[PDB]
Ligand binder design. Structure first.
Ligand SMILES: *[C@@H]1O[C@H](CO)[C@@H](O[C@@H]2O[C@H](CO)[C@@H](O[C@@H]3O[C@H](CO)[C@@H](O)[C@H](O)[C@@H]3O)[C@H](O)[C@H]2NC(C)=O)[C@H](O)[C@H]1NC(C)=O
Ligand SMILES: *[C@@H]1O[C@H](CO)[C@@H](O[C@@H]2O[C@H](CO)[C@@H](O)[C@H](O)[C@H]2NC(C)=O)[C@H](O)[C@H]1NC(C)=O
Ligand SMILES: *[C@@H]1O[C@H](CO)[C@@H](O[C@@H]2O[C@H](CO)[C@@H](O)[C@H](O)[C@H]2NC(C)=O)[C@H](O)[C@H]1NC(C)=O
Ligand SMILES: *[C@@H]1O[C@H](CO)[C@@H](O[C@@H]2O[C@H](CO)[C@@H](O)[C@H](O)[C@H]2NC(C)=O)[C@H](O)[C@H]1NC(C)=O
Ligand SMILES: *[C@@H]1O[C@H](CO)[C@@H](O[C@@H]2O[C@H](CO)[C@@H](O)[C@H](O)[C@H]2NC(C)=O)[C@H](O)[C@H]1NC(C)=O
Ligand SMILES: *[C@@H]1O[C@H](CO)[C@@H](O)[C@H](O)[C@H]1NC(C)=O
Ligand SMILES: *[C@@H]1O[C@H](CO)[C@@H](O)[C@H](O)[C@H]1NC(C)=O
Ligand SMILES: *[C@@H]1O[C@H](CO)[C@@H](O)[C@H](O)[C@H]1NC(C)=O
Ligand SMILES: *[C@@H]1O[C@H](CO)[C@@H](O)[C@H](O)[C@H]1NC(C)=O
Ligand SMILES: *[C@@H]1O[C@H](CO)[C@@H](O)[C@H](O)[C@H]1NC(C)=O
Ligand SMILES: *[C@@H]1O[C@H](CO)[C@@H](O)[C@H](O)[C@H]1NC(C)=O
Ligand SMILES: *[C@@H]1O[C@H](CO)[C@@H](O)[C@H](O)[C@H]1NC(C)=O
Ligand SMILES: *[C@@H]1O[C@H](CO)[C@@H](O)[C@H](O)[C@H]1NC(C)=O
Ligand SMILES: *[C@@H]1O[C@H](CO)[C@@H](O)[C@H](O)[C@H]1NC(C)=O
Ligand SMILES: *[C@@H]1O[C@H](CO)[C@@H](O)[C@H](O)[C@H]1NC(C)=O
Ligand SMILES: *[C@@H]1O[C@H](CO)[C@@H](O)[C@H](O)[C@H]1NC(C)=O
Ligand SMILES: *[C@@H]1O[C@H](CO)[C@@H](O)[C@H](O)[C@H]1NC(C)=O
Ligand SMILES: *[C@@H]1O[C@H](CO)[C@@H](O)[C@H](O)[C@H]1NC(C)=O
Ligand SMILES: *[C@@H]1O[C@H](CO)[C@@H](O)[C@H](O)[C@H]1NC(C)=O
Ligand SMILES: *[C@@H]1O[C@H](CO)[C@@H](O)[C@H](O)[C@H]1NC(C)=O
Ligand SMILES: *[C@@H]1O[C@H](CO)[C@@H](O)[C@H](O)[C@H]1NC(C)=O
Ligand SMILES: *[C@@H]1O[C@H](CO)[C@@H](O)[C@H](O)[C@H]1NC(C)=O
Ligand SMILES: *[C@@H]1O[C@H](CO)[C@@H](O)[C@H](O)[C@H]1NC(C)=O
Ligand SMILES: *[C@@H]1O[C@H](CO)[C@@H](O)[C@H](O)[C@H]1NC(C)=O
Lengths: 449, 113, 129, 129, 129, 52, 51, 53
């Protein structure tokens, strides 16, 4: 009847906590120094230990997850560390005088721009020619002549990315230090937030490839069983809707232009790589998506959309009516070049009750990713012909709202933030700290002696 | 000290266009959406659409879908609202609103022009 | 029959206490200025801080080498009034730690002062002759 | 009756020895290149180094789990000739640490050699049969 | 009679085991981003990690505070066939560590399982009444 | 004063002084003479504790 | 401290102390030149003669 | 000027080599071979230990 406290070391008790998670990658030996894997990251264990927790129900909230804000600040910090030692194109802001590279074509997306440039010597100046895209160049007079300048030279500085680093995303395992644990939600039918029935624990997350995408989520993890409609608030039109597929759709993108690399020295050791004459035909980049597969997959999505907007309702899909630059096009990197594909042909359907789709793509070289006002990167010309085949596994939609009496409902693609890309791979993970100390009364007392 | 300054009174012909300015001051312009609400003389409030200064992505209401074009200028911190093909009922006072600093969500217009 | 780290997290407090050895093992085990290197460096220091923190408390409680350790502190009824059958055969350590969370700071203060702060002096005087 | 950290600094050595758990608790517990981060990280590493330094000596002295530990080393009169009344009931640990500071190194050497360097070998030979 | 750090490296295992405290002591003890500061900080964490690594293994062996610790694991003849006189009075700890280096991982695995994984349950059941 | 922001490079913005709107008046500080004399006296009383 | 009855293998060619020291001297050189005056404008065409 | 950038050494720093001792951190030790006739590689009979070179 007399109760005394007793110390227990190793009690299964955890509490919600946010810590600094570190990197974990497999032994990928190789042309190296990719931004993400960088010089040295911790080698993943040969055999991961995923441990299921029986009769454990844990609350999850993918939208208030702290793992997303860490990863988002890790990608951005990795970008700047890989551009500090590279060549800055600050003198490349000379008044450009361009023409039409369009091979004597009557009735073009790139201009030919000749300019005066500095040399290895200071007193010596050279005149060189280089091909540029129309999207990276604006006229200098609008009065109008044919004199131009770079798009960034008026707002931000420009730095030429080093030609040795690759932008290919490799799997990244986010790992928790000792004393902390990650609770994985293994529920097949788990929506955004709420209690997860089947919960397990892991030390590191799975191989998350940091694929910087817009509208379309490429090279992502598929959802098991049925497709999932995740959103912070479905009743909110200002909140994006993350959709995860179950059957992966395929998308083939190529840059048929066989570009050439024209290295011109702009200073002692400073080598600016410009675009030489394209060998062969001028063909704009594009992407092919199977119309039979996309229509099939789109239909599987509207079946789950009606589970949140009435069993019978009008659901239509239109192109992005708001924004510019990269939020209105499916922007992504592929082999080094940054594509900007118009997805007007994908979101052009209306729902009630082998002939693939071609998507026009435009390519830039001066890009401004992650809201970075002040720093612009120059992608060096990728020599050769580019072809990459991706798995589109997710979408980022947005309602139009309005005073409609729930009769019709439109959906438009968007990409207002990059944190939404990482949430589609961190929705199931949750970081908690382990507290192995627990007191409990028993009928045992320490011997007085 | 959030300051929202709009343009002056406009007089346009039916079918013509009008662009309404909205210069912000006292906060980070690229961190909060910008809404647009009009009110006919003697009527109630009517939301038109919000625009994200970050990427420029907008969200026009279904009633004005295909007539209004909302743009922004980050250098001068000024959002714009242009309405094409003006009808007889478009006579109204056009306000630009902003969400609250608190609560981490929209739909609480504390600051108005 | 082993389930793994935190395997008996949903079990009763009596079934989970039989596998305290499981959670005890997985509780500790040109330029290096990479963001991952900084993260690894700060994670290793963070890991040994939480490990030595638990061993420090077990040291001042006289429970350094054991995993189940009895004490001199009598259980106050204001902390919890549940019966022995209602705790070890009805509640889990998760919901139990949430119930005693408001008194764990007071218990720890009495857990180190009532016994091992007193025992060492009594053991000094008992071994005086 | 607890006064707080360093509460018994001005008290007698006998009254201060009853509050050893007080000093024991408060003894251990885009870019992070900020001047304060470098300081904070270097302060945590410097802290855990000093903690394990003392615990290191408690290992070789056989006093790992206890706060008060009796030994086999006889006190030499050359270190201090005061009696138990003059030390424990008239002196503070501050002015006592100042009086033995010239011999603390010599005491430590015998404290690790005379006993636990000899006792463990005798423990092996006594438990040999 | 002390020779210094690693003084008994070439002596027999019987003469070297009497100086375990020697190697145990010297085992743990505008911008600071200089090449020497970053190396110094990473070396101090490396030092305390190697130290806690050995202390962790001595914790699962029940030998945390002792320098010479006897166990319940029987010595298999497949590890070495030499006699006690041929080991402690002919071999040094260097060449002895080379001979058993192929079995140290198997001994360590059995050292945690044969005793302290079994004793703690029996220690709980013997002190249960 | 007014801020006259002039761009001097790609992304580099130099902020110079514009024309002063209004009258030209040099900066100044005031301080109560009565309060300053009183505090000054309370100092010299303590200064004499070290100089006779 | 001399170690009697100890025979250790040495290999001056596979020594790691040399590879670290070589990286230390090189790293010290760049850090002592970063805050110094860079002579990038001193690339003007020189017109010289003989003494 | 045709190949690499150039940096003028500060006139305050000196290039005079001064003795540098390489030391080992805690838990590590440096073994010095004191053999007079010690060639490149091979076992060293007379072996001592130091903390710094
Ligand atoms: C999504 O995942 C796919 C598949 O993992 C990625 O495709 C990868 O594309 C790169 C770039 O072309 C391929 O590297 C290539 O290797 C050949 C040698 O055979 C070389 O000639 C090329 O110049 C290029 O270096 C890579 O092999 C390919 N992946 C695989 C597994 O073969 C794609 O880039 C990922 N990202 C996106 C946004 O789709
Ligand atoms: C872009 O302009 C450059 C001149 O700055 C062109 O280079 C020369 O063009 C002529 C024909 O106009 C050729 O005969 C030369 O062989 C070209 N090279 C040189 C080094 O002079 C270049 O052809 C232009 N490109 C396009 C597509 O119009
Ligand atoms: C893109 O253009 C390059 C440059 O001409 C092509 O590479 C040439 O291929 C031919 C094959 O008959 C070789 O004889 C040349 O020597 C290659 N060029 C160089 C500079 O060595 C390349 O083949 C083109 N791309 C593709 C996909 O064919
Ligand atoms: C989204 O689709 C609409 C479909 O109309 C595009 O708007 C058309 O753009 C062409 C190109 O100049 C014009 O000739 C048509 O008059 C436009 N139609 C309407 C109704 O405005 C729109 O351009 C597409 N979005 C983007 C970003 O291009
Ligand atoms: C400096 O400015 C402060 C402003 O508050 C002056 O203090 C005020 O003085 C007026 C004088 O009529 C009083 O009515 C207010 O009640 C005062 N307010 C406070 C907060 O003190 C102050 O006098 C000025 N400094 C000097 C030297 O006059
Ligand atoms: C040259 O390119 C401009 C850019 O659009 C185009 O308007 C013009 O028609 C082109 N020149 C000719 C002769 O077509
Ligand atoms: C280059 O310099 C010459 C001489 O001043 C000038 O005639 C020419 O227009 C310049 N070219 C450009 C592109 O500025
Ligand atoms: C998930 O479903 C539950 C059950 O209705 C609901 O309470 C919760 O808000 C949903 N979460 C999301 C993100 O839709
Ligand atoms: C695409 O999906 C298939 C099937 O899930 C998978 O085997 C393949 O590796 C995926 N490829 C990419 C690039 O994601
Ligand atoms: C993409 O290329 C692969 C090459 O194996 C082909 O099998 C697939 O059908 C292509 N898909 C599209 C949509 O072009
Ligand atoms: C999509 O599939 C439905 C169902 O068979 C069909 O009626 C419709 O025509 C298809 N649409 C397209 C664009 O293929
Ligand atoms: C959208 O779909 C309709 C119906 O098939 C088609 O006529 C129209 O051309 C499509 N839009 C575009 C821009 O091709
Ligand atoms: C889960 O519940 C079952 C059924 O009562 C029980 O046998 C099992 O031990 C429980 N496990 C945990 C971890 O709670
Ligand atoms: C019992 O608990 C109360 C409140 O926690 C405390 O004030 C009191 O001292 C305790 N009594 C004993 C005998 O532990
Ligand atoms: C303990 O159990 C008895 C039933 O045997 C019950 O009446 C009593 O209330 C319990 N004690 C509590 C709940 O504190
Ligand atoms: C300090 O000195 C006073 C003298 O009366 C004594 O009573 C007290 O115990 C001493 N220690 C304290 C106050 O900690
Ligand atoms: C105390 O130390 C002195 C000085 O080394 C020595 O002469 C004396 O014998 C020692 N006495 C005892 C009892 O240890
Ligand atoms: C103890 O030492 C003090 C001071 O040296 C002295 O006054 C006293 O007589 C000694 N003996 C006792 C029994 O206090
Ligand atoms: C310790 O040595 C110093 C230096 O000679 C001396 O001044 C001091 O009195 C000594 N203290 C003791 C307690 O012997
Ligand atoms: C030694 O190991 C072998 C192989 O497992 C085993 O058969 C034998 O019984 C062991 N002997 C002892 C004495 O442990
Ligand atoms: C033991 O390990 C050493 C390592 O060099 C190896 O040479 C030897 O063959 C091994 N012996 C056995 C029996 O495995
Ligand atoms: C300075 O002098 C110039 C001379 O033309 C005049 O135009 C200007 O208004 C004066 N003031 C400022 C603020 O520049
Ligand atoms: C300072 O004030 C005191 C008291 O008000 C007065 O006696 C003295 O004359 C004053 N001194 C000056 C310099 O005003
Ligand atoms: C150095 O001495 C060792 C002694 O064993 C010998 O094996 C080796 O060949 C010698 N090397 C040279 C280059 O003489």
């Amino acid at each position: 009847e007399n109760l005394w406290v007793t110390v227990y070391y190793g009690v299964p008790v955890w509490k919600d906590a946010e810590t600094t998670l570190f990197c974990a990658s497999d032994a990928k030996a190789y042309k190296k120094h990719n931004v993400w894997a960088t010089h040295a990251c911790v080698p993943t264990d040969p055999n991961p230990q995923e441990i299921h927790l029986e009769n454990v129900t844990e609350e999850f909230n993918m939208w208030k997850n702290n793992m997303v804000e860490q990863m988002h600040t890790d990608i951005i910090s990795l970008w700047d560390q890989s551009l500090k030692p590279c060549v800055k194109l600050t003198p490349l802001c000379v008044t450009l005088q361009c023409t039409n590279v369009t091979n004597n074509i009557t009735d073009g997306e790139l201009k030919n721009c000749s300019f005066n440039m500095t040399t290895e010597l200071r007193d010596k100046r050279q005149k060189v020619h280089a091909l540029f895209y129309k999207l990276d160049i604006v006229p200098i007079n609008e009065n109008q002549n044919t004199s131009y300048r770079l798009i960034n030279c008026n707002t931000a500085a420009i730095t030429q990315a080093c030609p040795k680093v690759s932008f290919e995303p490799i799997p990244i395992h986010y790992c928790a230090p000792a004393g902390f644990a990650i609770l994985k939600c293994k529920d097949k039918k788990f929506n955004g937030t709420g209690p997860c029935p089947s919960v397990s624990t892991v030390q590191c997350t799975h191989g998350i490839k940091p694929v910087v995408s817009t509208q379309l989520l490429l090279n992502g993890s598929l959802a098991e069983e049925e497709v999932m409609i995740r959103s912070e608030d479905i009743r909110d039109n200002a909140k994006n809707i993350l959709v995860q597929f179950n059957t992966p759709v395929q998308i083939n993108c190529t840059r048929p232009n066989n570009n050439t690399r024209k290295s011109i020295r702009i200073g002692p050791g400073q080598w600016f790589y410009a675009t030489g004459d394209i060998i062969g035909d001028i063909r704009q980049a594009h992407c092919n998506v199977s119309k039979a597969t996309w229509n099939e997959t789109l239909g599987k999505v509207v079946k789950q959309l009606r589970k949140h907007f009435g069993n019978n309702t009008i659901i239509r899909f239109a192109n992005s009516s708001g924004g510019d630059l990269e939020v209105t096009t499916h922007s992504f990197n592929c082999g080094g070049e940054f594509f900007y594909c118009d997805t007007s042909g994908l979101f052009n359907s209306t729902w009630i009750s082998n002939d693939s789709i071609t998507l026009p793509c435009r390519i830039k070289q001066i890009i401004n990713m992650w809201q970075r006002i002040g720093q612009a990167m120059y992608a060096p010309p990728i020599q050769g012909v580019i072809r990459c085949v991706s798995n589109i596994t997710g979408l980022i939609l947005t309602r139009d709202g309005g005073s409609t009496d729930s009769t019709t409902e439109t959906f438009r693609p968007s990409g207002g933030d990059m944190r939404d890309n990482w949430r589609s791979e961190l929705y199931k993970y949750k970081v908690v700290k382990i507290e192995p100390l627990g007191v409990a009364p028993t009928r045992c007392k320490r011997r007085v002696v | 000290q959030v300051q929202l300054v709009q343009s002056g009174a406009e007089v346009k012909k039916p079918g013509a266009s009008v662009k309404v300015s909205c210069k912000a001051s006292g906060y980070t312009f690229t961190g909060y959406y910008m809404h647009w609400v009009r009110q006919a003389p003697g009527q109630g409030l009517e939301w038109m659409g919000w625009i994200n200064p970050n990427s420029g992505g907008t969200n026009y209401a279904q009633k004005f879908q295909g007539r209004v074009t909302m743009t922004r200028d980050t250098s001068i911190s000024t959002a714009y609202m242009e309405l094409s093909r003006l009808r007889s009922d478009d006579t109204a006072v056009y306000y630009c609103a902003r969400r609250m600093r608190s609560q981490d969500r929209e739909w609480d217009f504390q600051h108005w022009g | 029959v082993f389930l793994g780290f935190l395997g008996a997290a949903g079990s009763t407090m009596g079934a989970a206490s039989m596998t305290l050895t499981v959670q005890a093992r997985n509780l500790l085990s040109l330029l290096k200025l990479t963001v991952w290197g900084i993260k690894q460096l700060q994670a290793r220091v963070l890991a040994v801080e939480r490990y030595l923190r638990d061993q420090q408390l077990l040291g001042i409680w006289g429970c350094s080498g054991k995993l189940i350790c009895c004490t001199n502190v009598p259980w106050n009824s204001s902390w919890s009034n549940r019966n022995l059958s209602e705790i070890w055969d009805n509640m889990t350590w998760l919901q139990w730690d949430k119930e005693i969370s408001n008194y764990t700071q007071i218990i720890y203060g009495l857990l180190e002062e009532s016994q091992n702060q007193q025992e060492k002096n009594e053991q000094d005087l008992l071994a005086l002759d």
